[PDB]
Amino acid sequence: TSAMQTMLFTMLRKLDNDALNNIINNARDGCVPLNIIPLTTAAKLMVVIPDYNTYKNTCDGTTFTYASALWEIQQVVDADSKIVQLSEISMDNSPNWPLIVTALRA
Amino acid sequence: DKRAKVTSAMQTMLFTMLRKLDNDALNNIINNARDGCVPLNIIPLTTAAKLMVVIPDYNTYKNTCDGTTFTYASALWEIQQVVDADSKIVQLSEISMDNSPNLAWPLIVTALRA
Amino acid sequence: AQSFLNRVCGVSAARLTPCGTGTSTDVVYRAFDIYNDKVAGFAKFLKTNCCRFQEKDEDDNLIDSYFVVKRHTFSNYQHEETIYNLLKDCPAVAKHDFFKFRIDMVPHISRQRLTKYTMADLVYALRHFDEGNCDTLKEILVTYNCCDDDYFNKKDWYDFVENPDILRVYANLGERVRQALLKTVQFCDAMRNAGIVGVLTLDNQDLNGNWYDFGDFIQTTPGSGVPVVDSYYSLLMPILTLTRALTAESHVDTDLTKPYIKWDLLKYDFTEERLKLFDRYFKYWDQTYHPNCVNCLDDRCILHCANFNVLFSTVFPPTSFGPLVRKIFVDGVPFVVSTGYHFRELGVVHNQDVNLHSSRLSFKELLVYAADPAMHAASGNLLLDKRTTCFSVAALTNNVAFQTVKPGNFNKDFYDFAVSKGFFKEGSSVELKHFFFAQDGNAAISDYDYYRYNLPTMCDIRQLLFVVEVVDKYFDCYDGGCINANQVIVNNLDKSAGFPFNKWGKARLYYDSMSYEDQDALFAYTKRNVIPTITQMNLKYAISAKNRARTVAGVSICSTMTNRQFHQKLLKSIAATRGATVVIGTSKFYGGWHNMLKTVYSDVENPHLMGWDYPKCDRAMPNMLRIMASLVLARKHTTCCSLSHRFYRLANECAQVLSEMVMCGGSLYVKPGGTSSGDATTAYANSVFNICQAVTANVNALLSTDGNKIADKYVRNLQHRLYECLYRNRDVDTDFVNEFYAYLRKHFSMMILSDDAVVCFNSTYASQGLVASIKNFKSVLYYQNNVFMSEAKCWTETDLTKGPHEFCSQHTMLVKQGDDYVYLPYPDPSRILGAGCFVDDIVKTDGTLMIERFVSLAIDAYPLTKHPNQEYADVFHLYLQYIRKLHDELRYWEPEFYEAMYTPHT
Amino acid sequence: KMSDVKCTSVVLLSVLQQLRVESSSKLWAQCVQLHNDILLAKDTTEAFEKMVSLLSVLLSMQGAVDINK
RNA sequence: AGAUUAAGUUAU
RNA sequence: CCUAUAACUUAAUCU
Numbered sequence A: 001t002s003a004m005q006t007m008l009f010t011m012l013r014k015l016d017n018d019a020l021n022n023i024i025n026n027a028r029d030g031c032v033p034l035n036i037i038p039l040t041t042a043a044k045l046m047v048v049i050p051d052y053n054t055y056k057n058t059c060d061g062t063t064f065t066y067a068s069a070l071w072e073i074q075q076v077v078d079a080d081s082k083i084v085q086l087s088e089i090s091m092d093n094s095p096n097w098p099l100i101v102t103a104l105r106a
Numbered sequence B: 001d002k003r004a005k006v007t008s009a010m011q012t013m014l015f016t017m018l019r020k021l022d023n024d025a026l027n028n029i030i031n032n033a034r035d036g037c038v039p040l041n042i043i044p045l046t047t048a049a050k051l052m053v054v055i056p057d058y059n060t061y062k063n064t065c066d067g068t069t070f071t072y073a074s075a076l077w078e079i080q081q082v083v084d085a086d087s088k089i090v091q092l093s094e095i096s097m098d099n100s101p102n103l104a105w106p107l108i109v110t111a112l113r114a
Numbered sequence C: 001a002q003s004f005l006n007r008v009c010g011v012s013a014a015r016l017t018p019c020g021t022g023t024s025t026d027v028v029y030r031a032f033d034i035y036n037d038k039v040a041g042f043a044k045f046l047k048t049n050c051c052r053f054q055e056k057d058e059d060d061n062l063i064d065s066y067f068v069v070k071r072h073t074f075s076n077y078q079h080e081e082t083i084y085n086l087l088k089d090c091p092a093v094a095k096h097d098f099f100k101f102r103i104d105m106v107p108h109i110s111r112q113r114l115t116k117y118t119m120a121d122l123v124y125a126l127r128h129f130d131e132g133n134c135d136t137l138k139e140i141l142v143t144y145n146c147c148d149d150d151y152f153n154k155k156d157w158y159d160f161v162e163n164p165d166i167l168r169v170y171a172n173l174g175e176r177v178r179q180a181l182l183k184t185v186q187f188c189d190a191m192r193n194a195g196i197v198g199v200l201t202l203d204n205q206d207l208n209g210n211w212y213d214f215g216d217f218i219q220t221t222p223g224s225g226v227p228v229v230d231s232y233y234s235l236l237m238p239i240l241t242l243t244r245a246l247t248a249e250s251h252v253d254t255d256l257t258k259p260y261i262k263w264d265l266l267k268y269d270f271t272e273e274r275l276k277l278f279d280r281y282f283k284y285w286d287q288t289y290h291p292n293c294v295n296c297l298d299d300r301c302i303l304h305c306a307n308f309n310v311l312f313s314t315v316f317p318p319t320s321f322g323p324l325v326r327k328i329f330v331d332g333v334p335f336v337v338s339t340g341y342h343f344r345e346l347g348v349v350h351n352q353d354v355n356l357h358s359s360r361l362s363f364k365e366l367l368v369y370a371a372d373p374a375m376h377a378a379s380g381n382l383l384l385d386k387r388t389t390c391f392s393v394a395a396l397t398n399n400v401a402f403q404t405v406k407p408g409n410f411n412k413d414f415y416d417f418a419v420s421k422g423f424f425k426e427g428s429s430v431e432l433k434h435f436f437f438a439q440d441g442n443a444a445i446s447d448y449d450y451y452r453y454n455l456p457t458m459c460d461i462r463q464l465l466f467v468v469e470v471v472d473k474y475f476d477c478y479d480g481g482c483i484n485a486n487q488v489i490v491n492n493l494d495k496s497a498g499f500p501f502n503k504w505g506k507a508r509l510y511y512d513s514m515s516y517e518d519q520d521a522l523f524a525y526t527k528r529n530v531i532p533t534i535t536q537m538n539l540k541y542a543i544s545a546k547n548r549a550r551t552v553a554g555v556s557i558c559s560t561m562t563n564r565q566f567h568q569k570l571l572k573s574i575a576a577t578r579g580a581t582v583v584i585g586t587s588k589f590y591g592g593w594h595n596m597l598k599t600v601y602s603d604v605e606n607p608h609l610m611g612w613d614y615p616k617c618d619r620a621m622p623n624m625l626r627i628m629a630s631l632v633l634a635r636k637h638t639t640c641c642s643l644s645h646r647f648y649r650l651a652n653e654c655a656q657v658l659s660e661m662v663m664c665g666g667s668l669y670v671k672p673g674g675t676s677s678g679d680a681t682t683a684y685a686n687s688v689f690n691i692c693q694a695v696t697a698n699v700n701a702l703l704s705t706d707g708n709k710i711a712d713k714y715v716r717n718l719q720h721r722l723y724e725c726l727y728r729n730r731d732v733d734t735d736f737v738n739e740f741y742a743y744l745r746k747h748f749s750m751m752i753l754s755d756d757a758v759v760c761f762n763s764t765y766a767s768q769g770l771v772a773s774i775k776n777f778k779s780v781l782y783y784q785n786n787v788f789m790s791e792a793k794c795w796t797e798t799d800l801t802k803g804p805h806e807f808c809s810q811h812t813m814l815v816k817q818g819d820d821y822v823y824l825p826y827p828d829p830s831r832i833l834g835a836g837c838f839v840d841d842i843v844k845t846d847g848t849l850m851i852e853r854f855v856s857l858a859i860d861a862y863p864l865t866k867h868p869n870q871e872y873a874d875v876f877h878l879y880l881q882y883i884r885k886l887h888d889e890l891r892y893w894e895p896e897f898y899e900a901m902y903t904p905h906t
Numbered sequence D: 001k002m003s004d005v006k007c008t009s010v011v012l013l014s015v016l017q018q019l020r021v022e023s024s025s026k027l028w029a030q031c032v033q034l035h036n037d038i039l040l041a042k043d044t045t046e047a048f049e050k051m052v053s054l055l056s057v058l059l060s061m062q063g064a065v066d067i068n069k
Numbered sequence E: 001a002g003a004u005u006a007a008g009u010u011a012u
Numbered sequence F: 001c002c003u004a005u006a007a008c009u010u011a012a013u014c015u
Ligand SMILES: *P(=O)(O)OC[C@@H](CO)CCn1cnc2c(=O)nc(N)[nH]c21
Pocket: C552, C617, C618, C676, C677, C678, C682, C683, C686, C754, C755, E012, F003, F004
């Protein structure tokens, strides 16, 4: 049960692939993905951001880096369907947190 | 020894299939026959009160069970309930071409004989 | 020149253009069904005695109509005119014009408005099919509006599996074939009323249906003419179900524009309709036709009549076939049991032992009521399943079950050990290609949907009767017959007992619960009654190289018990015989592979090796060939069973493993045909089917070759006698069956194991066309097996130093063993490494059971050490080092033990 | 190499199957599809993209804590 | 050397 | 839920 789960991550960490490591690190910090990552030309991806400091390291503008790929942000809701502009993000309005980002890749 | 258990289990199962059996529309086809002998493939086709339709996609649904009532096997069948592959109750408001990617196909509709 | 062209026009005043130049004849390459004392067979020849003229349209465009002017002699001219004047009123006769023209005054016979190709060209194009050499078939398809000319730009257009639209394209020819049948019956009536005796051949009727050759016709007293139509109908019989020629008989008034006939739902007999169809389309076929095969005289008569029934059962509705049920009272409480069966092949069969009133149920009659599907379907719901195109009888439960297949369990310690030993490098010869593929919940019904490849197939019945005699010679050395219940040997009693018997116990419970007298009473009951049974489909969890799901068929305990008691003596006698053609039961160990190969290379003179593939073999096998295979096995019951007993055993096998009710996921379906994988006789019936298709390919090779260019006079006389024994002679000629069998054993040496085959054949005879090749197998599988066999799945080995390329998925190497050279079987190393890396239980990756598992895999992996490839040889040393590592982490580890498994001393 | 990701796909799909992911047939169908197409992949760049798409099914539900690992 | 039971492996 | 047949290996009893 759990030995299968330990033998997964001991051989996942030996493939040494940046995309697998990028999503396992993001998952470790709580930046998990709600749906399945698509690998087609363009489709939708929903990424949950727990709080601010793990958002600036991924998002700088209209493009965020995920699984060694670039995904352009379309919508940010926060524990509602409370749409939030992209100009909002700064530490200056940090109390202004389970947050969803629904984007599309190139 | 163990012969008694399996013969009682065979006898018990074979009898409760007669409690399930329709017994009055069955007699109307079993006595309209020339020799009292009918094919088996027409027994659930003309007597069974419940019909199950397994539908793979949306085109098959609109061609087969569009509306609350549909006609199959020269009879009239009114849908009772629809479930998906995960056996969750689907309403008829959900089965549209817009919401067709969100459903767990196939859908198994169940229709009583009207 | 122009004057001759004007004379050909005549009263028609048709605009003609010449296909030849001047007055000289035009040479065409057509297919003729010829029987002389010079030559025989159904081959392609040169027709050199005809001048052809094409008739232009109103806008000066070429149409299908042709004017055929034939010049032979004066005596044939006067004789054909005398026959035509008797036959001119018939509308099935093409209009003839007799004249003389001065080219020196040679006489001419002008036939008016014929098509380009005859019926024999169509029959030969469909019965000798070749991809890239199907120009005649393409021209026929685009001429009679079956498809456009750009249909052949789609690749795999001819393939029945890759493109099922070719069935519709071929069905566009069926109305022309049906019109040719009606015109043949009209021509035979006109020959009988006018007193004319002659043979009808397929090359004398065009694709319009008109008859035009009378050179071999002789006159007799009127009212008593006899037409001979055996070669005609027999060579035409596969086309009747390929083109679906009797499709118009389903409609009202036989009119394709009119709607369908709404038959009665309670109607099942269709005996008089079968007789009306036989009198309408095959009136002058001389052999008696029984619509119900219970009235047949022997097993050859069963084959002959079941062949007409597959054709005539495509007209009737599919709800009439299957079990025939009748209400009976048990202690006054009523049942619904099966008192008969309506077969597509055998007609109506009624049970002889049935009581309407029973006052107690024994274990045996409870068993036949539980096994019977009539009770199960009369209680369940109606089911309309749209995932599959197969017939759906009933849904037994209110749910639909969705069985998935789990992935394999990874064996990490062996993979880490193998990576540490240098395996799985980049660019290496050995890589993992065998895995456990998981399946989603729609896998079970998607594998069941592959019974759409099974089509109703009518056979060439004369050819099939000769082939079943030759096939019978192969099984001659074996002993068979019925045995008692105490002589039955069961390999594994703790296996499934099928449905609905798996709710109460395994097979051990039913073998312990019935006495020997009850088992013998049940076996005697199946000799006078038909017990319909339900077959369970189960997804099988096993390693593979392809992502296709694999289902196994679970047969009921009643069927497999009576079938063991009927067949096991012959099956044990086949399994315990060495040196024969069927090599079921022969081990590859202890020199047995070398003995099998030495036996296959017996007396071939210019030896080459050949193996082939059956695409979708379990699915697409025709019902006539399965019945033929069943009859061959039942030819050992000549002294223990009467003909009625043998018919009822055949009817029980057809109702149990051929067209039974199949329970796939809590719902009942109708199996169209094919072989159940869980019957006792499956591998052996597959062996009979393989030998039958090989003998059919050799017959079609020897008859389609030009008899004038066969250099050996023995082979030419053999081809003449082959045509005589197929089409002219009705009774079995056992001396020619022996002679053709000895010819086959001399020049076509086989090794058969359950649709896997290796043939050592004479190469010079195959290049001359005297024995079969891959092309003949492709043609036979096209017109008979309804599949396309690509030549990439086949192999050919010209150097017999190297062995067969693959047999039972094992390759072959020549190995210095001791003082001599032997043949050793080695497997693909990906399969061996995948068996060690992936297991189906989490209990097979420790130090408990994995030692004896790895030993068995090292036994199967030993002969890779003689391979020239180094990684191939290192597979065995890896398994050996790992058996050591398991042996010290708690005589086999030493390499000598493995060598002893392949040396000839047992 | 390619064999490492072909074995890791097998381990991951058995991990997902232990977490009762076949309770939803829609998710199990594309999990089975991704696993079967990793096991039939020839180029290793094609196998890696599917591995990301399949591992995100595990990183979607909160049933296996990666914090512990 | 033979038979019986249990388990396993391969082939079809 | 887990088929049929064949071969082989291992273990244990009786001979
Ligand atoms: P082979 O695998 O190429 O054989 C073809 C085959 C049809 O599936 C028929 C052989 N056959 C019949 N019954 C079988 C069974 O239960 N298991 C296997 N592997 N092969 C069977």
